[PDB]
Amino acid sequence: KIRTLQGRVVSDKMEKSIVVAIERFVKHPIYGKFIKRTTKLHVHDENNECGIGDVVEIRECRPLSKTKSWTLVRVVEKAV
C-alpha cells in the first residue's frame, strides 16, 4: 500500500542514524547475467534501536539531513 524496501544495516555508530545496504538483483544490460547490486542509504531511526547486521524495513520521507531522506518502519531478524 506504501512503498518500502529492505536490507541489512551496515553501521549504526552515529546517533539517530543508520546506514542500510539494499541489495537489488538486476540483469546485466549486455551479457544477460543477473548481478547483485548494492545500494547504501542513510536512514533515520528514532531511539537508536537497530544494530549492526540487523535486517530492517525502511520507507522514504522528507529529507531529514544532508545525506538522509529515509526512515524505517519496522525490524525483522533483530538478533545475531
Added chain:
Amino acid sequence: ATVNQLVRKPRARKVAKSNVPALEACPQKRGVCTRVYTTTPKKPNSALRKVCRVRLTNGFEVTSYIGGEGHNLQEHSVILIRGGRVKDLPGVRYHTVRGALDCSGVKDRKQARSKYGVKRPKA
C-alpha cells in the same frame, strides 16, 4: 571469455590512430613550402620523386608528394595538401593538390584531367 570475466573486465576495442594526423580530421590544410627537393624511393623502384617539406598552418612540419609531371614549386610557396601516402617513399604521407593557391596544373594533360587541376581544352 567467461561471462563473469566480461562483467569484471569488458571487451575493450582498438582505438585506431589515423595515418594522416596532420590534417586533424580536415580534408585539406594550407601549407607553406619550406624545401622543395627530390628523393630516391625504396629498393624495388628507382626514380627521383618530387616531394616538398611543408610547414602547415596548424603548426606541423610534414613532407608532401607533388604528383604529376612538372611543377612550378619554389620555397615560400603556399600550397594545399590533402592526405594520402606514397607507398614507395619512406615518411611521405600527403599529396599536394595540383591547382590550389600557388600550384599550377600539369601542362598538356588530357586524361584524368581533374585530378591535376587542368581546365578542359577548348577547341
Added chain:
Amino acid sequence: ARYLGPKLKLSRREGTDLFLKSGVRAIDTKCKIEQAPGQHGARKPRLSDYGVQLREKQKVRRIYGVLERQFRNYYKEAARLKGNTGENLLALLEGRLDNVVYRMGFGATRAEARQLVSHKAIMVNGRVVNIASYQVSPNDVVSIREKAKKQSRVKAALELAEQREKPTWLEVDAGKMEGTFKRKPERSDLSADINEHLIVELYSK
C-alpha cells in the same frame, strides 16, 4: 538526365533486342546485333559472375530508360513492399506513365512515348500529367489529349502496336486514342528472358 547517344549501340552491348527502335525496319539490317560495339567487338570474353549481374541490370535499365539513382529508388520501394521483391521491381517499371503510353502503342518507341508525356500531350483521368515516371494506379484511364490527337506520329504508332503482342492488363481504344490500365501485370505477363533475380542479388551486397 537522359541517354542521348546511339540506341542500337546499347542493344549491341546487351546482345539482344531491347525494342529501342520502332521495328519498322528489321533490327538485324540496321546493326550487327550479334556483335558488341567498338573495335574489340568481335571478341566475347569470359564474362565474370559480377558481369552477368551487371549486364542483367543494365539490360532492364536500358529497356525502360531509367538512370541509376532513380532505378535504385525503385529497388528500395520494391524491397519495401510486400511479396516478391523482383516482381515488384518489374511492377513498378510497368507502372510508369511512359511505359503505359508505349504499351498502349501511343508512341512508337519508349523514348517517343516519353516525349508525348514530356510535351504535355497525355491526360490521365482527364488531368494532364507531365512526368514520365508518373505511377499509374489500376482502373485509370489515360488518353491522348485533344490538341495532339491530330499528330501524325500518334496514329502511326497505333499501327505499329498491332504488329506487337497485345498486353492483357490493358484495354486500349484506338479510335478514341485512349486506354485503361485495368490492373498491374503479373510476372508471367512480361518477358521471360529477364532474370529479375540477378538484379535483386546485385543490390544486396
Added chain:
Amino acid sequence: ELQEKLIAVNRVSKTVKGGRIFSFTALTVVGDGNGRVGFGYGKAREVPAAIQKAMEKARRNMINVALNNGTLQHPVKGVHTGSRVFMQPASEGTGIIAGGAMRAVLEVAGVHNVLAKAYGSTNPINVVRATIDGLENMNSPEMVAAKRGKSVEEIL
C-alpha cells in the same frame, strides 16, 4: 539436364630435380535444379583437361537434398576444416544471397531463396564441402515425422 559450374581454377606446383613442374586444379559442382547436388575436384597438366576430370567425378557421388518449394527448410550449419557456414531459408524471390563458392553450389542445388554467410576460412574447396555437408543433414518435415513417430501435422 545437369547444369555444370566451375567455381575456381588454380595452378599448383611440384618441385623436382629439373625445376618446377606446374599443374592445374579445377573445382566444379553439378546439379539438376533439384536436390541432386555433387561437386568434383580434378587435376591435370592442362586447364581443359582439369575441368573434364572435375566434371567426371562430379557427375557421380551426387547427394540428395530435401528442399522446400524454392528454399531451404530450417537454418542449418555446416563445417569442414576451415569453414563454418551458416545458411537460412528465406522469403520468396529474395534471390541467392550467398558468397563466392557458396553461390555456385546453391545455384545448381536448385534453391532460389537463401540467406547465407561463410565464416572462417573461405577457401573454395572446403567451403563447398561445408555446404554439401550442411545441406545433407538438413531434414524434411516428413523425415522428422517418421523419425519421431508422429504425423507432420503434430509437428506443424
Added chain:
Amino acid sequence: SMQDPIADMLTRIRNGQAANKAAVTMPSSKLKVAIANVLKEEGFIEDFKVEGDTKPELELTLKYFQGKAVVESIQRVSRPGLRIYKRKDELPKVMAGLGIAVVSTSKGVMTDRAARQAGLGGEIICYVA
C-alpha cells in the same frame, strides 16, 4: 563438482545416442522426470522409468530410427552460470519448428509450442533438435 544435474542428463543422452547404447541411466530428480516426460511425449525417447527408493535411478530407453540416432542435437540453453528467461512472445523456434525447446513455465515443464498455446512463457531448459 556436480554443478548442474540437468546438463548431466542431456550429456548422457547425447553420449548415449552417439555410442549406440540401448538405455541410459542416471540419478533421478523431480525436474529430470519432467524433462523425460516431455522427451517421451514429443517422441525423442521410447520410454523412461524411475527405480529405487533411497537413491532413485532414472533410466531412459533411447530411440533409433533407420539405424542412426533420433536425437540429432541436444543443447543446454539456460545454465547455472547464465540463466535464460524469455517472455511468451520471444519463445524460440528450434529448427524452424521441427525441433522443440523444453521450457519451464509456471504451469509446469512443457514444450515451447504448448507454451504459446498456454499463453505464458518462462525459462528455456534445453533445445532438442
Added chain:
Amino acid sequence: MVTIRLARHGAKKRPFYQVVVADSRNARNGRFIERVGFFNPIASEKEEGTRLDLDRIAHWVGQGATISDRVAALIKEVNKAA
C-alpha cells in the same frame, strides 16, 4: 496563461496548422501541452481541413484557457458545418 492556438507546421508556401494547447510564454512551434486537432488552409475539396476535439477544447476553456482569434473562428465553423 494557458492558451489554445495554432502552430505552423507545413512546407514553404503551403502551411498547415496544428491547433495545440500551450502555455502562452512558450514558442509557437515549441513546447505545448496537448494537441487537440489540426487546421489546413490549403485544404482540397473532398478532404477535411478542420478537425477539432471540442470536448477537450471545452475542457481547457473550463479550466480557464484562452482562445486565439483564429481558433475562435474555427470553433464557430465546426459548429456551423456540424
Added chain:
RNA sequence: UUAGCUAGUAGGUGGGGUAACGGCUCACCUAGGCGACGAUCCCUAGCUGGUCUGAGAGGAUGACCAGCCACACUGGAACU
C-alpha cells in the same frame, strides 16, 4: 602507471534562515561519512528525443527540428 578521501566534514540538539525540506547557516555535542559495486584525482565532454551504420545485437554520433540545462567582454555582487 589516480587508492585512499573528508572537520560543516558525517550525525544529533537548539537558535537563525528560505516560498519550502535540509549543515542551508551558527553555537554546542557526538566521531563519524565516502571508498575496490572505483571514493578522491586527472583528461575529455552539454544531455536527451534522435541521426548514421548494421540482418540483428551492437558500434559511431548529438548539425538542422523539439524538450531540458548552462552561459551573455572577464571576475563578482545584489537590487527591483
Added chain:
RNA sequence: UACCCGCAGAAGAAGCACCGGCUAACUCCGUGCCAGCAGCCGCGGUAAUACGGAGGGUGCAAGCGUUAAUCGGAAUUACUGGGCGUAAAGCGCACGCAGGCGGUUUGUUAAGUCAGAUGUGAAAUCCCCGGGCUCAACCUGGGAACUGCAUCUGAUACUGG
C-alpha cells in the same frame, strides 16, 4: 506567384571518372627503372592492355572524381558470435577471504521469473495503411512502435529466501 493559354523555332542546354588483377570495360603510338603511376598486389630497364597521348570502351550523369570522417565487410574484443599442446595466449605450484556457483526431498515465501491490468514512456522522427501538392522529394490523418519503468492483481515449474 502557382497555374493556364498563345507565339517562334531543334533552336538556348554534357560532362566527369575509369578500362593489369580485385573490378564492369582494349588496342595503337610516344617513353625506355627515366618521366611517372599507385587503395592493395605491384607496374616502368625498347615490342607497357598498369606511365603520357590517341582511338575505342565502361560506369555515372548536372554532376563526376579526390580527400577527410563514421559504421560495415571484421566472427579482426566474438552478449548474439572466437580462442589459448605446437600459430598471439593456462599464472611455477598451492592454500584461501570477498565474489561466482551448487546434490536430493517436503513445506513455506513470492524476491527473481511469468501473465494480466492500470499509469507513464512529449510531439516530431522511423514503420504500416491512407490523404494532399501534375509525380517524387515533401506535407499530412489514423495506427503500430517507443522493446522501458512504476504500481496492482495473479501464476509457482525453475532460481533465490
